[PDB]
Amino acid sequence: AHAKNHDYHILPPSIWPFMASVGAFVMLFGAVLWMHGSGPWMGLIGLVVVLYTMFGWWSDVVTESLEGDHTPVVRLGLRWGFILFIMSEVMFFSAWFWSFFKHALYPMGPESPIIDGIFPPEGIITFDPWHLPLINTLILLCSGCAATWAHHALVHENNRRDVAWGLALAIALGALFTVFQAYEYSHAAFGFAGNIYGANFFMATGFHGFHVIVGTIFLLVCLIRVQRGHFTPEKHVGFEAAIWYWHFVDVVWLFLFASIYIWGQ
Amino acid sequence: RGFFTRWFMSTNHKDIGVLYLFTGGLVGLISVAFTVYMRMELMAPGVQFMCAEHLESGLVKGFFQSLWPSAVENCTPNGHLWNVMITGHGILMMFFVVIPALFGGFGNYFMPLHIGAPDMAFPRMNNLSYWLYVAGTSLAVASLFAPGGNGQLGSGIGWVLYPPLSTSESGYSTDLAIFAVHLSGASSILGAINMITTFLNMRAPGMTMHKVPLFAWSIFVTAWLILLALPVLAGAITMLLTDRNFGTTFFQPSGGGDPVLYQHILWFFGHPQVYIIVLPAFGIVSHVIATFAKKPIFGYLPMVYAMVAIGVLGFVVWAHHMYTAGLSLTQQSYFMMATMVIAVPTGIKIFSWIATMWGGSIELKTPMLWALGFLFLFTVGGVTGIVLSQASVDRYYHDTYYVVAHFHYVMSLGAVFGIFAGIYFWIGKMSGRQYPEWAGKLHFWMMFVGANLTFFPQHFLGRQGMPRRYIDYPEAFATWNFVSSLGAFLSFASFLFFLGVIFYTLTRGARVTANNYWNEHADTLEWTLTSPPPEHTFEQLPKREDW
Amino acid sequence: GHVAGSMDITQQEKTFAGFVRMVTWAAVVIVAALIFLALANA
Amino acid sequence: LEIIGRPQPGGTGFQPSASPVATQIHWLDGFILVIIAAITIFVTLLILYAVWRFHEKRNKVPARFTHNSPLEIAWTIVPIVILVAIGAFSLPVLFNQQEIPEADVTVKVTGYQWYWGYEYPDEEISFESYMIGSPATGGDNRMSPEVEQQLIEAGYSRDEFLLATDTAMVVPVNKTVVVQVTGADVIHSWTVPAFGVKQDAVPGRLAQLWFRAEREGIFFGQCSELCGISHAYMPITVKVVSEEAYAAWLEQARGGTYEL
Ligand code: HEA
Ligand code: HEA
Ligand SMILES: CCCCCCCCCCCCCCCCCC(=O)OC[C@H](COP(=O)(O)OCCN)OC(=O)CCCCCCCCCCCCCCCCC
Ligand SMILES: CCCCCCCCCCCCCCCCCC(=O)OC[C@H](COP(=O)(O)OCCN)OC(=O)CCCCCCCCCCCCCCCCC
Ligand SMILES: CCCCCCCCCCCCCCCCCC(=O)OC[C@H](COP(=O)(O)OCCN)OC(=O)CCCCCCCCCCCCCCCCC
Ligand SMILES: CCCCCCCCCCCCCCCCCC(=O)OC[C@H](COP(=O)(O)OCCN)OC(=O)CCCCCCCCCCCCCCCCC
Ligand SMILES: CCCCCCCCCCCCCCCCCC(=O)OC[C@H](COP(=O)(O)OCCN)OC(=O)CCCCCCCCCCCCCCCCC
Ligand SMILES: CCCCCCCCCCCCCCCCCC(=O)OC[C@H](COP(=O)(O)OCCN)OC(=O)CCCCCCCCCCCCCCCCC
Ligand SMILES: [Ca+2]
Ligand SMILES: [Cu+2]
Ligand SMILES: [Cu+2]
Ligand SMILES: [Cu+2]
Ligand SMILES: [Mg+2]
């Protein structure tokens, strides 16, 4: 912009968007074939492309902040947007939590809905909340505390060794949750097909796990950034989203934990 | 300026706005077309067009014969065709057509100008919005050619996909439509975020929220609904996909499922949808009433608050769409009472409009006619909704043509009007070519004439009990049908008219050279700019006094 | 004519602050409500 | 044969009042219609009026008012009072229809794709009804000599094509019938416009609905909830007869013969 008076970021053209929309189309259409007896190849191609897109796109995001496009308002603009994203995320989970709560309260039975059945479902074996569940909840709370500690250092003391230290700790504890999570599946007392409790129990923690992984990945990115010195106490947006997001995951797990392990036994 | 550079790698919010428009036009036509097909078959009793026999002929082959009557005797009633059509319509129309012109075409382009911002907060993202919308559409269309229920192609299920019908239906057709819906969701949620950051963050100095144009507040409320309502619908349909692809049992009584919860999860998002469709419409009307009655929009705060009013109530009235699917009396009351409340907020909007016109001089220009039709018909529509809001009366009305009319009056004779309203009023601004004041009028008069014919009869049918989504009906119902169908053709005519009128104008229209071709009262910032606006609108920030 | 970062953001920072507060209000109001309902009719 | 509750060619109203709830439903709608008849008219009249009274050549100069307190208040209370009213005359008609009585008979109706399924738990009676055109009765759901003839033999005429069923569900005048609807496979809906009753058969669910006829005859209802291809091919027919011939119906339906 030849002669502007404003700090908002205006962007050169960009192919990324179109690319990613084809990747997804192919992704999903391959994903429909693959759940219909046919071959994976189409599905992975779709995702491979999308993943190429996303990386670029985000690489460029950083690159653009490095060219000093991320002025004061810009910085705030992204902050905001990301916050609607977690708002959205929160709504999605409201679907899964809504089924759980309805079935848990008004389970189906032969006289439904004059009369309700029984929950947990007959012959269902809910897990022990204090054995592994608590383990995974200590594991995230802890990681939470280790990722925020990174944040504050950087912003408050400008200590960068400490910053990367908080991050590794936090990142490897995120993966641990995954590992423990999977254990839980391995040892599950009920199945996934044919029984509401399996679908709810599985899809719900299924979605949460998705996110942890996303979370743990994200963080990974920051560590890397932090290793090549990409963050200052004033400018540190990836970091801000990261910590905000990790926190949302943790919140969601904590409510799950209270809703499905602790309250539904 | 590579052609591929411009539209294929767009970062500008005025072009993305155009892309959505035509895109949405396109599909509407296609969709609209499916509408004549139906009307055709429903013109008269028995099944003359959707016979079984045409299936033997390749698609190329029977297609063409399908546009030509057969005798009852030799006609083999293929209900599945009809179902797949009905749903081609619905799915296209509430997800590919009307929300992408009105929210992403007129909003994307103008909401920004009215506040006096350079461009949308997230340009790359926005472009991604527009492309996801295409995939959406494409999967959605492809679905009409893939392995459908009953050995045919195509999912004949319902715009909303209810189970167990939706979970038992063979093929992978419905899987495509499920994912279409997701990519559409995606689209609006990216869109939604972008306008929400944009509008709070990028407005011009001195522009207070209470200093913003109606139309951008409309997109603002619209956007919020979206944000909070699509998510819930991603979920619903994930449950339909895992039931049919992963043998789950969300809504499968054999596994302790409950088809009704689905209806709860889907109407909680299926109510917010309409308030998205009309929201923007309310916005474009104010403008147009303001400009053409050459007088400030009456009760501007109340208008804004009305809009918030609606949007909030819009999340707490979804069981009105389930009055007979097995609900507690306490649940019918709560939902009947609270759904009645929305009246307050809308009437206010309706009265203000009449009070804007009151005591101003009026310009019956094309744009205005629509705006006035809209005030009428949306009221028509409206009332019905109160009749439908009463569980009691709903029994008899639910699922019958009486509800078909109420939605088309507020959708086809409502939001749709808005769309056109928008179109006529802003065609030069975004083209540098004005349209013909005659044609327009003609179009407006045809459409009002025939669209009234199309749906008004349907009120009768509804009270004479004709059921919804039937491909044939009793002898008793021929009379009105005829009328209706006739009606539909007329309107279909008109839409053709309009496209040409459009074509012509973008070909041979009046070059536009003024920055405001209308009059002093159109006061927002879009009118200060050229005609067709600069590539980078607002490099220089609009000085406070400027407007 | 480059002066990156020297634009006035007073009005946006006030805005975000409001935004922040408004949502929190909202959220909490719902949960409350949900709870109410629960108590009243679950 | 008294065919009462049926669509009437070119009709723009309802179907005969066969029972109390129907009675009230018509009355409710009537009353609601005039209230909105007046609103609609009203709202156009200003529109028109204003459009002409203040068309540019009739009032060259615009005004600048944007607010009139007293009037806004008026137009926000008015409506509100209007709605309450409707309330007053609406809830009551929902409660009478959703609060189910002591039955004098009791059927159980089971939506099966492309046919209904009647049961009379006390009388150990259980039979199914299909349209006359169903492939269950040779046809492919469309008029044919065969069909025409079939219906004549039934006691119906060429014109009630899509409403007549091989198997009627008989019923007592003056008696309270409670119908507990459920679906078999996907979702259907059973309903009889003259009775003013209707509801959805849903897989995994017992829903109840009550009705009383005041008069005899053949009433006709249609499947209302997209339940597949022959969605427009699962008529419903309800007979209502004297109690003396209801009882003999009992005995006569015990021998496997399910027609009156
Ligand atoms: C944008 C589209 C749109 C809009 C804006 C509305 C608005 C309303 N709709 Fe609906 N509606 C649909 C689209 C829309 N609707 C669709 C598509 C369906 C079917 C979905 C499907 O099954 O596929 C449907 C279905 C539907 C049903 C269920 C039908 C059934 O059982 O099958 C109901 C029932 O309560 C309903 C109610 C209402 C009401 C009260 C409003 C209110 O918004 C109306 C408010 C407007 C007014 C009240 C007039 C303005 C007020 C005044 C002028 C004051 C004077 C008058 C009075 C005070 C009374 N709508
Ligand atoms: C708002 C969306 C919308 C629109 C515009 C329409 C428009 C029309 N629809 Fe409808 N229709 C639906 C949404 C819509 N429909 C839905 C959701 C259903 C229920 C689906 C289901 O059961 O799942 C339905 C159902 C439905 C049915 C009955 C279904 C049944 O048996 O159960 C009929 C019956 O005759 C019908 C007719 C028509 C006609 C003649 C038109 C029009 O052709 C008449 C007048 C309008 C026009 C002539 C053109 C308007 C054009 C545009 C708005 C273009 C937009 C793009 C640009 C402006 C650039 N529609
Ligand atoms: C098994 C192993 C297989 C692994 C495959 C590997 C593929 C790699 C995929 C990884 C993706 C990389 C993610 C990195 C994103 C973050 C980008 C970033 O941090 O820059 C953005 C900007 C930072 O700016 P700032 O911090 O201020 O700069 C300071 C410099 N002085 O801050 C911003 O602009 C904010 C941007 C936020 C990012 C948005 C995230 C939300 C989207 C979530 C959707 C989930 C997608 C997951 C994919 C699944 C497929 C559907
Ligand atoms: C019960 C409902 C719970 C809903 C779950 C929501 C999860 C919340 C996410 C928690 C993560 C926060 C942890 C903070 C650690 C480091 C980051 C931080 O402290 O950001 C501070 C920020 C203040 O921002 P500010 O000072 O205005 O920035 C410059 C101002 N010109 O303060 C912020 O802006 C933080 C922004 C993150 C927002 C995440 C998404 C918010 C969505 C709505 C949730 C509101 C929850 C309601 C809580 C009830 C309280 C009674
Ligand atoms: C993620 C980290 C933290 C967690 C984030 C998400 C929090 C979600 C917490 C709750 C989410 C919604 C839960 C709703 C529970 C409702 C249970 C239910 O289904 O009620 C039963 C009733 C129908 O019952 P029925 O079968 O019809 O009758 C049988 C009676 N014999 O069903 C009904 O009438 C409907 C019940 C009311 C529906 C409520 C739906 C609103 C959903 C939006 C929630 C808003 C979340 C905001 C979070 C704030 C974060 C900042
Ligand atoms: C109905 C619910 C369905 C759930 C789907 C929800 C959304 C799916 C889309 C995934 C990607 C979007 C992630 C959104 C994160 C946005 C956070 C934010 O505010 O990001 C800001 C950044 C700005 O973008 P830009 O215009 O380029 O601004 C440059 C300024 N330096 O924005 C970015 O960094 C943009 C990065 C986008 C990543 C590319 C991937 C596109 C994905 C499309 C596939 C959708 C399928 C969803 C499947 C979920 C199924 C449950
Ligand atoms: C009980 C069940 C309810 C059902 C859910 C209901 C939700 C419906 C959503 C509709 C969204 C509408 C939002 C509109 C709010 C507008 C209020 C407003 O603008 O107040 C004016 C105030 C004044 O600021 P002033 O300085 O005078 O002018 C600006 C100059 N910079 O402006 C400000 O201080 C800034 C205002 C910012 C606007 C806030 C927008 C957020 C509102 C959404 C709440 C989200 C709830 C999220 C719950 C799920 C979270 C996970
Ligand atoms: C950190 C560790 C974590 C630990 C945290 C511990 C705290 C746990 C917090 C849990 C919160 C979850 C709440 C669960 C909700 C349950 C309430 C419910 O589901 O009641 C439904 C109510 C009764 O259902 P009903 O069918 O009548 O049952 C009759 C049985 N005789 O249904 C009715 O009576 C019908 C009435 C319908 C009324 C609709 C009202 C709207 C609901 C709210 C509006 C949603 C709008 C939200 C907007 C979102 C966007 C902002
Ligand atoms: Ca026909
Ligand atoms: Cu609704
Ligand atoms: Cu059926
Ligand atoms: Cu049916
Ligand atoms: Mg229904």
- The residue ranges of every structural domain in chain B are 1-547
Residue with tokens 């054999």: B254
Omega of the bond prior to B164 within 30 degrees of 0, cis? yes
Residue identifier of the C-alpha nearest atom 33 of ligand 5? B264
Q: Which residues lie closer than 8 Å to C30 by C-beta, 6 or more apart? A: none
**Can you tell me the distance from the alpha carbon of B461 to that of D14, in angstroms, rounded to the nearest whole number?**
9
Answer yes or no: is B321 a known binding residue: yes
Using most ligand atoms within 8 A of CB, pick from B124, B129, B193 the residue to mutate for ligand 6: B124
DSSP-H helix ranges across B93-172: 98-102, 106-115, 123-142, 165-168
**Can you tell me the distance from the alpha carbon of B356 to that of D63, in angstroms, rounded to the nearest whole number?**
10
- In angstroms, the separation between the Cα of residue B260 and the nearest Cα of chain C is 17
Q: What Cα–Cα distance (Å) separates residue B510 from each residue in A4, B426, B514, B529?
A: 33, 14, 12, 18
H helix or E strand, kind and range, residue D179: strand D176-183
Neighbours of B236 (CB within 10 A): 27
Provide the 8-state DSSP code for A174.
Answer: H
Choosing from D45, D70, D101, the residue where a domain stops is D101
Provide the 8-state DSSP code for A230.
Answer: -
Check CB contact of D100 with chain A, cutoff 8 Å.
no
Closest CA to D66 of B290, B218, B376: B290
Which residue type, as a one-letter code, is found at position B32? V
Which residue type, as a one-letter code, is found at position B391? A
The rounded Cα D100 to chain-centroid distance in angstroms is 18
**Can you tell me the distance from the alpha carbon of B463 to that of B472, in angstroms, rounded to the nearest whole number?**
17
The rounded Cα B450 to chain-centroid distance in angstroms is 19
Omega of the bond prior to B10 within 30 degrees of 0, cis? no
> Which CATH number covers residue C42?
1.20.5.160
> Which CATH number covers residue D46?
1.10.287.90
Contact call for C42 and A3, based on CB within 8 A: no
Neighbours of A45 (CB within 10 A): 14
For residues D208, D210, D216, D221, the Cα torsion angle rounded to the nearest 10 degrees is -50
Q: Is D135 a domain residue?
A: yes
Residues from chain A that touch B11, judged by Cβ atoms under 8 A, are 10-14
Of A11, A20, A107, the CB nearest to B11: A11
Tokens of D103: 């039955």
Which residue type, as a one-letter code, is found at position D101? P
Answer yes or no: is B287 a known binding residue: no
**Can you tell me the distance from the alpha carbon of A18 to that of B132, in angstroms, rounded to the nearest whole number?**
8
> Which residues form the domain of C24?
1-42
**Can you tell me the distance from the alpha carbon of B386 to that of B348, in angstroms, rounded to the nearest whole number?**
16
Which residue type, as a one-letter code, is found at position B531? S
In the reported structure, the alpha carbon of residue B43 is separated from the centroid of ligand 9 by a whole-number distance in angstroms of 6
Residues from chain D that touch B343, judged by Cβ atoms under 8 A, are 79, 83
Asked: is B1-547 a CATH 3.30.420.10 domain? The reply is no
Which residue type, as a one-letter code, is found at position B385? G
Q: Which residues lie closer than 8 Å to B129 by C-beta, 6 or more apart? A: B16, B104, B187, B188, B190, B191, B194
Whether residue B372 contacts residue B344, with contact meaning beta carbons closer than 8 Å, is answered with: no
Q: Is D259 a domain residue?
A: no
Burial of B177 (0-12, 13-18, 19+ CB in 10 A): buried
Choosing from D37, D72, D101, the residue where a domain stops is D101
Q: Is D85 a domain residue?
A: yes
The rounded Cα B404 to chain-centroid distance in angstroms is 15
**Can you tell me the distance from the alpha carbon of A165 to that of D15, in angstroms, rounded to the nearest whole number?**
78
In the reported structure, the alpha carbon of residue B443 is separated from the centroid of ligand 4 by a whole-number distance in angstroms of 52
Angle between helix A133-152 and helix A237-256 axes, rounded to 10 deg: 160
Do C and B make contact via 3 or more CB pairs under 8 A? The reply is yes
Domains and CATH numbers, chain A: 1-69 (1.10.287.70), 70-265 (1.20.120.80)
Whether residue B76 contacts residue B53, with contact meaning beta carbons closer than 8 Å, is answered with: yes
Provide the 8-state DSSP code for B467.
Answer: B
- In angstroms, the separation between the Cα of residue A110 and the nearest Cα of chain D is 8
Q: Is D236 a domain residue?
A: yes
Neighbours of A148 (CB within 10 A): 15
Q: Is D1 a domain residue?
A: no
In the three-class reduction of DSSP (H, G, I as helix; E, B as strand; rest coil), residue A243 is classed as helix
Domain count, chain C: 1
- Compute the residue count for chain B: 547
End-to-end CA distance of chain D: 10
- Compute the residue count for chain D: 260
Measured in degrees and rounded to the nearest 5, phi and psi for residue D173 equal -65, 155
Whether residue A100 contacts residue A200, with contact meaning beta carbons closer than 8 Å, is answered with: yes
Q: Is D220 a domain residue?
A: yes
* Experimental approach: X-ray
Q: If you measure CA to CA, which chain B residue comes closest to A10?
A: B119
**Can you tell me the distance from the alpha carbon of B316 to that of B273, in angstroms, rounded to the nearest whole number?**
13
- Compute the residue count for chain C: 42
Q: If you measure CA to CA, which chain D residue comes closest to B328?
A: D98
Whether residue B478 contacts residue B466, with contact meaning beta carbons closer than 8 Å, is answered with: no
Q: What Cα–Cα distance (Å) separates residue B497 from each residue in B500, B506, D131?
A: 5, 14, 44
Whether residue D198 contacts residue B396, with contact meaning beta carbons closer than 8 Å, is answered with: yes
> Which residues form the domain of D96?
6-101
Measured in degrees and rounded to the nearest 5, phi and psi for residue B349 equal -55, -45
Which residue type, as a one-letter code, is found at position D88? A
Residues from chain D that touch B460, judged by Cβ atoms under 8 A, are 11-13
Contact call for D226 and B474, based on CB within 8 A: no
**Can you tell me the distance from the alpha carbon of A215 to that of A172, in angstroms, rounded to the nearest whole number?**
11
Give the largest CA-CA distance in chain C.
64
Residue identifier of the C-alpha nearest atom 43 of ligand 7? C23
> Which CATH number covers residue D227?
2.60.40.420
Residues from chain D that touch B326, judged by Cβ atoms under 8 A, are 199-200, 202, 205, 207
Measured in degrees and rounded to the nearest 5, phi and psi for residue B74 equal -95, -5
In the reported structure, the alpha carbon of residue B331 is separated from the centroid of ligand 8 by a whole-number distance in angstroms of 13
Whether residue A29 contacts residue B176, with contact meaning beta carbons closer than 8 Å, is answered with: yes
Neighbours of A157 (CB within 10 A): 11
Beta bridge partners of D219: D238
Angle between helix D69-98 and helix D20-53 axes, rounded to 10 deg: 160
Q: Which residues lie closer than 8 Å to A135 by C-beta, 6 or more apart? A: A180
Closest CA to B512 of B529, B499, B491, B536: B529
Whether residue D245 contacts residue D53, with contact meaning beta carbons closer than 8 Å, is answered with: no
Check CB contact of D15 with chain B, cutoff 8 Å.
yes
Whether residue B155 contacts residue B84, with contact meaning beta carbons closer than 8 Å, is answered with: yes
Choosing from D101, D125, D147, the residue where a domain stops is D101
Omega of the bond prior to A113 within 30 degrees of 0, cis? yes
Closest CA to D56 of B367, B355, B291: B291
Please enumerate, by residue number, every residue of D annotated as part of a binding site for Cu cation: 188, 223, 227, 231
Residues from chain B that touch A73, judged by Cβ atoms under 8 A, are 201-202
What b-and-e string marks burial along D91-102, b requiring 16 or more CB atoms within 10 Å of the CB?
bebbeebbeeee
End-to-end CA distance of chain B: 32
**Can you tell me the distance from the alpha carbon of D100 to that of D108, in angstroms, rounded to the nearest whole number?**
15
Beta bridge partners of D215: none
**Can you tell me the distance from the alpha carbon of B515 to that of A146, in angstroms, rounded to the nearest whole number?**
58
Q: What is the CA radius of gyration of chain A?
A: 22
**Can you tell me the distance from the alpha carbon of D75 to that of A228, in angstroms, rounded to the nearest whole number?**
65
Atom nearest to B495 CA in ligand 2: 48
Q: What angle do CA C11, C12, C17 make, to 5 degrees?
A: 100
Burial of B143 (0-12, 13-18, 19+ CB in 10 A): buried
Ligand 12 ion: Cβ-proximal residues, 5 Å cutoff: D 188, 223, 227, 231
In the three-class reduction of DSSP (H, G, I as helix; E, B as strand; rest coil), residue B91 is classed as helix
Domain count, chain D: 2
Q: Any residues with Cβ below 6 Å from ligand 2, and which?
A: B 21, 24-25, 28, 32, 35, 38-39, 42, 86-87, 89-90, 93-94, 97-98, 101, 158-159, 404, 408, 411-412, 416, 419, 451, 454, 468-469, 488, 491-492, 495
The rounded Cα A172 to chain-centroid distance in angstroms is 16
In the three-class reduction of DSSP (H, G, I as helix; E, B as strand; rest coil), residue B394 is classed as helix
